[PDB]
Amino acid sequence: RIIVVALYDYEAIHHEDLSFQKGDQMVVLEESGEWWKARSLATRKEGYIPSNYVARVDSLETEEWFFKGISRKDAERQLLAPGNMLGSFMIRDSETTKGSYSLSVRDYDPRQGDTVKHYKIRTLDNGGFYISPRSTFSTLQELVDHYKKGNDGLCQKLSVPCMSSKPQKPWEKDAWEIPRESLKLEKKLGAGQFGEVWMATYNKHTKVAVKTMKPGSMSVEAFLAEANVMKTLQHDKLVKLHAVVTKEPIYIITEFMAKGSLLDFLKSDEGSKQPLPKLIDFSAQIAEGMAFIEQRNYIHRDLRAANILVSASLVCKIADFGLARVIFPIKWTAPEAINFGSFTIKSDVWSFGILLMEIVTYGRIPYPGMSNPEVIRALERGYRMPRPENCPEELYNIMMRCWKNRPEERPTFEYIQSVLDDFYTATESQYEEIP
Numbered sequence: 001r002i003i004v005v006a007l008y009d010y011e012a013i014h015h016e017d018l019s020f021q022k023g024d025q026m027v028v029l030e031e032s033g034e035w036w037k038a039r040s041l042a043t044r045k046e047g048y049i050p051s052n053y054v055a056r057v058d059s060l061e062t063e064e065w066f067f068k069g070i071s072r073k074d075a076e077r078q079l080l081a082p083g084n085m086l087g088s089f090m091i092r093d094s095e096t097t098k099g100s101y102s103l104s105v106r107d108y109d110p111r112q113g114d115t116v117k118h119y120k121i122r123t124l125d126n127g128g129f130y131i132s133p134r135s136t137f138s139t140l141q142e143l144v145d146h147y148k149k150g151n152d153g154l155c156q157k158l159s160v161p162c163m164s165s166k167p168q169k170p171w172e173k174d175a176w177e178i179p180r181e182s183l184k185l186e187k188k189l190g191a192g193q194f195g196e197v198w199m200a201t202y203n204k205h206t207k208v209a210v211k212t213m214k215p216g217s218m219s220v221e222a223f224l225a226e227a228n229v230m231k232t233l234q235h236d237k238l239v240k241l242h243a244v245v246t247k248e249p250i251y252i253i254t255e256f257m258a259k260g261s262l263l264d265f266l267k268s269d270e271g272s273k274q275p276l277p278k279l280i281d282f283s284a285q286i287a288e289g290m291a292f293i294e295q296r297n298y299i300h301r302d303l304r305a306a307n308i309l310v311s312a313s314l315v316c317k318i319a320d321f322g323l324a325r326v327i328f329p330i331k332w333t334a335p336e337a338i339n340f341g342s343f344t345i346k347s348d349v350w351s352f353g354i355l356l357m358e359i360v361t362y363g364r365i366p367y368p369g370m371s372n373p374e375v376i377r378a379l380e381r382g383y384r385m386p387r388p389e390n391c392p393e394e395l396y397n398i399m400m401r402c403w404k405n406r407p408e409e410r411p412t413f414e415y416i417q418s419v420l421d422d423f424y425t426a427t428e429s430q431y432e433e434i435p
């Protein structure tokens, strides 16, 4: 008899899902992925619930100060986000010491500004926890309560648990292929050589984005084969692919990203006010996405600012990945790909380097004043874009390393992500050691 508890409020919008408040306890009848079958102890109704809205009773995830599956860098992004303050803290699973927990706290110093510091919580052998050997606790709550009443060697006294947001509600069960009737395409956002992008609505309840592919040479059968591969590339830094309409003209359904393209965003009022370490954080998120793609042995083929999407909370997401294998931007293209049509993860690295320049120049066109063929002649001479005023010297070396003539001499996304994530932090300073 498994009993779980709700971490957030949820309001049913489908036929057989259940509504509940945060705190409600439910009996698990069937575990089966994103949707579970349960019975609400408050209403006695049987139905479906999102598995990621609940957790077993009195387990760690029930606690407000606990955060599951958060990397050290995710913790720092989450803590430095609005609504938090000094002593804002979180306990989370260790990224480097698997099976163990780490503590992250919001801090300040005038030389650097607001920061996040990290402490490793060492699990005892008796079953206790400590950051400092001088001080040991029986429960993580005991740990928390203590450092909440005084610094006792930390950088800050613990104030309030980090801000959390409700996760995305999962897509309807077994609704991969959908009939056009489910969609109301309410506003066109973009139109191009190959189709349009629309802000839409799925069954009156969910906001989505729809990509309408004009019936090109694109084999229906061959597209959908690749779409089923794309469906398996689920990562927080790639746009969420929800569904598909199977008859020409083919429709593609993704999550809606409120702030549209990174290119348009950088060129807006709010974009123009982003400081440089924010621009660098964007870069790092994108590198994270590409490292995942690299990991899975995949190729993007069209990396640039216009194919990156921005969420309302400024999370960056890679879009249009691999879509070009199925179906201009030579200024983003590596020579081996231009001359010989050779497309690799290495040629993407070249593209990422150009995107970096796009980002740091707030969206400015690459090789300005130059035409495409002018640009081609220049490269084969050894020309490279110069360093703009605001770009730091070490950021520039990364771009330059991205623009090596020989593909093999280009670094990996794994390495790039790692550099960019800790651009302002020395390796020795990642964690804190307290006596």
Ligand SMILES: COc1cc(-c2nn(C(C)C)c3ncnc(N)c23)ccc1NC(=O)OC(C)(C)C
Binding pocket: 189, 190, 197, 209, 210, 211, 230, 239, 240, 241, 252, 253, 254, 255, 256, 257, 258, 259, 260, 261, 309, 318, 319, 320, 321, 322, 323
């Ligand atoms: C609905 O599908 C998309 C929508 C957008 C998109 N563009 N815009 C603006 C810039 C026109 C958006 N605004 C908000 N949300 C979006 N998903 C988009 C981008 C890309 C796609 N498609 C897409 O990336 O295709 C894959 C996932 C199969 C590789």
Ligand SMILES: [Ca+2]
Binding pocket: none
């Ligand atoms: Ca490896």
Ligand SMILES: [Ca+2]
Binding pocket: 428, 429, 430, 431, 432, 433
């Ligand atoms: Ca250290």
Ligand SMILES: [Cl-]
Binding pocket: 027, 039
């Ligand atoms: Cl019961």
